[PDB]
Amino acid sequence: QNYHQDSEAAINRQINLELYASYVYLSMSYYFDRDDVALKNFAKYFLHQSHEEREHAEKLMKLQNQRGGRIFLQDIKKPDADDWESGLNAMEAALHLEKNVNQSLLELHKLATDKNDPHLADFIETHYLIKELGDHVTNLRKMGAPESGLAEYLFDKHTLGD
Amino acid sequence: QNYHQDSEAAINRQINLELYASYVYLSMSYYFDRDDVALKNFAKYFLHQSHEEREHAEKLMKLQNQRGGRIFLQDIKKPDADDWESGLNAMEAALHLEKNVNQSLLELHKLATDKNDPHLADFIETHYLIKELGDHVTNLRKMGAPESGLAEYLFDKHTLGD
Amino acid sequence: STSQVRQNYHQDSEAAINRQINLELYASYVYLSMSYYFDRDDVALKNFAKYFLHQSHEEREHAEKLMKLQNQRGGRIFLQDIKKPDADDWESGLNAMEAALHLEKNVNQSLLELHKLATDKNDPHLCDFIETHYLIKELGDHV
Amino acid sequence: STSQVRQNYHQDSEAAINRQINLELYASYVYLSMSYYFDRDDVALKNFAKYFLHQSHEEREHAEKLMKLQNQRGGRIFLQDIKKPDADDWESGLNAMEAALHLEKNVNQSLLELHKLATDKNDPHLADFIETHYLIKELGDHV
Amino acid sequence: QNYHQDSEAAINRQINLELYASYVYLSMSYYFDRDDVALKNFAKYFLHQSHEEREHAEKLMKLQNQRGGRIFLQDIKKPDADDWESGLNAMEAALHLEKNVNQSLLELHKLATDKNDPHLADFIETHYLIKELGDHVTNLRKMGAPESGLAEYLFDKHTLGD
Amino acid sequence: QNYHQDSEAAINRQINLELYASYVYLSMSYYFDRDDVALKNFAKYFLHQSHEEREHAEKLMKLQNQRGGRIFLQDIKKPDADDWESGLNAMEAALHLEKNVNQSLLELHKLATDKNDPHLADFIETHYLIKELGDHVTNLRKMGAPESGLAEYLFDKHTLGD
Amino acid sequence: STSQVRQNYHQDSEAAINRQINLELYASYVYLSMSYYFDRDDVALKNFAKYFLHQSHEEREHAEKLMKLQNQRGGRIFLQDIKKPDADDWESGLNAMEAALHLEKNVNQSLLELHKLATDKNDPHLADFIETHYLIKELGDHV
Amino acid sequence: STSQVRQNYHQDSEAAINRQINLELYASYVYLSMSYYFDRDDVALKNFAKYFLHQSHEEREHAEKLMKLQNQRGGRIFLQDIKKPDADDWESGLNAMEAALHLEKNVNQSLLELHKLATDKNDPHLADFIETHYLIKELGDHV
């Protein structure tokens, strides 16, 4: 059967993908630590979400070795840009990103049809992480975002603080 | 006496009416829970008041039966619209709403002339809600909004968060 | 055009959800009116009055969960009229429960229907949700 | 033009409230006058100063209940001069004192007036408010 | 001596004055209670300061009666206007007002030269009230008052909410 | 050895420079207390940081007397301007300053090469003060600073209130 | 021109405060200087070290009380240079002591001067301040 | 051009930082690789799995300490690819349990080298930071 070698190939792509997002969210994070962006909360958000997607790839690697399979590590590609211009654009990307990262996670459940259903837990949390990202893109826009640097400052404070 | 069947008839209009508002209020709530709107505290506001107009119509049916009358339920008409445009518009509406809802709740008391004066507590409450409603429509207009999506955001947090 | 958060969510589902919403909403409305049959002195079963007000509120929350699901996956909520119960006077000993328990079928079935439609369109998120939101609504007696 | 919140609130009540605003305000002013007398050395009845300052802040509070009602039904508050009180024999043994009851009568009277005006115009809200507020305005002295 | 009648007549003009202050502030307060400028929190500001210039005139009449003098009560003239236009113009007036309230309070101390120095504790608190008024006027001006009605909202919340 | 006289000379330049830092942040501090400026939180900032650079000079003199050195005090010169224009331009000066105050604190360590490394602990916080200083300049410009004076009001409330 | 908040504040008072701000600050600079003479191993009077770091902090808070009055009355704070103390190597640390004597005197003096300039220009607020501030300042030194 | 917060930070130091940012990020990768090496049913050394997940996060935090120093001194963070755990041809018990020896060597070495460069460019803050970061790093491998 290719089912056992198709599915151990999927855990690896996701592991190298859920690790990628880890990188991007980290690159994003310290784009906001820098003095000429200086939105300490934007930093705190992604950096947490960066840990979340690290802890998420780490579960994939423990499911692999449980299911007998083997762990094929690939280069963690550097994100597409290291200057994310704006908060509104950093969100537009992490949205585009958790969506492409969620594209494959789906191909991983329709091809497993486990009785374990192990990952199904982290499939629900990625979806909670998408609506939150859309909600965050919408507010920035109406707030005459993104250019109004005022708008981003208040969102840093009143949305990424509580 | 037509008085026993007038009242039981004005009760059934109000029951279906105080029902409608709940529906209208539920529609508004999840018009803000949707990602192109994204004002959770708006969403939170109406879904409490929906429950409160619901709690208000549940009393009406317990009063009907307390009075021995009969409960003639009518269709809960779909609220006029499913997209409420802006926060400011949604408020202007439920102001139009709880005002027209009060109009017959007036026709109800004057046609009653009870010794029990039971709904007088809820008559006293439909009025606190209307003052608050204009109070919210006014703060919004002067905030340059709604053409200023910023405005609606800030109100979402500063007035609808405490 | 398209909502910025939509994924693997097929158009036949977005509609079927909105079907199940007006449904469950109808379910709150009959369950509601029902609690208030038993409450009339002609009946006087605070027990059975009591239980149907709760099943009204739980069915509405169900509606809520669904709505929050709709907007969660980027689909739009198009409400319809919550039709007045085609029932009118439920009444008698061991009564109208028949017309009552019934909807516990058509509600639950429309869900299992939704369950097969999700498997058809390979939407695993939708599947788990409905399975969580069928098991729950299970329990029939007393519940 | 019209305030966005008005409802079955007849222009006569709006003027009648505002007239009850200046009245309670005058009532506060006089009670104050009376109060700061019992304090003077020629009389030195701190018991009475005590009651008349307290009632001084309570008729002012009354006044505010009403203004908060005014802006609540949607009407506009027009304030007038608080006329000086006619009083001086602010002292004695069996006198002057009650000459203030004329106040408790005319105050409490203009209220019952406002109550019949509510009932003529069919504003059950204004009515239950005036009734609560007059009953609140209870009887005279206590221990 | 006219000094005994000088001072006891200054106490009265003042009693009639610090009373006026109370009245104006109370007029101001419920201008922000009404539905066309629903501010609430402003409203809490002045109505407390009306209490503070009432309890302040209440002390004046206790002193007159201690200093043997007499209490000559004059009309409480209606405030200059019963519409204040803008939170900005409410503050500006009370600055001007407390400024004219304080002018005479000076003519009251310079013409007293007591050993008791009674009112000198209330002369120090009307100055804390003057700096704080201009502090509220200044912030509102640079906010862009009034029109940007947006300004008066934020000031309402972030200045008067704490 | 000139070393004992170059280092005891470098201690005094700095004592007369971190003292000057104390004087600028005070002249800054009470330019915000004034009624036509009135940012109570801006004031609280420099009046605490001003305390931070007076405690900083008091350590220098105790180290001068510890290493046997002698304390040569100079005039504490009046700061460049006693009217700082804008919350943003005070931050640009205090930044421009803490960088020139740190320019010499460097020459003082490269010329020291202790086994004690006494002022090494204070070098690590003058750098925490600069990153922070730029972080606030950038939000201000950013916080769409300045012009719309409001910017500075929100920054006074939202960044400097917590 | 004029600040929106000034009253009965004469342009002389405005200037004599500012003289009083530079003074007190000069005091904090000398008292600071003194503490670290008693701190040097050549003197090793920690108690006198100790007493004079506290006199420095407190004559600086003084200056701040004064600045906050300036802006409180509506005048403008024009700061001058805090000159070095004429002192430097208090040989006999009694020279140190005699320095402060002529300091406590010139300070307390400029204050009492501010006191009669206030009586001159009929500014009862400025006067009560300087008085509290002088009484505060009095008190020899136990300790 | 230039960031508003840079001071005596030679561009040499800025480049040498971003190298150690990719280096210490690479190390998060290997230790992870190793860690889950021991978790496989074939090795079953939970203890070693556990310790390498610890050192994966603890060197990735290191990475952050660095980037945050970067943006502290005013320099710009440019990530590189986190190369795979080169892994010549290894994954059986008792294997390149080394690997990490040379890894810590090249990590701590590149650190120690960075110490010589601050000393050359007279950058005491960068030098003070790394001595701590290395001492922290030292002591560990065991027991």
Numbering used by the authors:
A (entry chain G), B (entry chain C), E (entry chain A), F (entry chain E): 10 to 171
C (entry chain D), D (entry chain B), G (entry chain F), H (entry chain H): 4 to 146
Which lines from the publication concern this structure?
As a standard structural component among protein nanocages, ferritin exists ubiquitously in both prokaryotes and eukaryotes.
In contrast, the smaller species was sedimented to obtain as s20,w = 7.20 S, which is nearly the same as that of NF-8 (s20,w = 7.4 S), suggesting that it is also a 8-mer protein assembly, and is termed as 8-merΔ3C. To determine the possible difference in structure between 8-merΔ3C and NF-8, the crystal structure of 8-merΔ3C was also resolved. Similar to NF-8, 8-merΔ3C also comprises eight of Hα- and Hβ-type subunits at a ratio of 1:1, which assemble into a bowl-like structure with an outer diameter of around 9 nm. The crystal structure of 8-merΔ3C is in good agreement with its structure in solution characterized by analytical ultracentrifugation and TEM. However, removal of the intra-subunit S–S bonds in NF-8 did not inhibit the formation of the Hα-type subunit in 8-merΔ3C, suggesting that the intra-subunit S–S bonds are not essential stabilizing forces for the structure of Hα. The formed 2D layers further arrange in the vertical direction to create 3D porous protein assemblies.
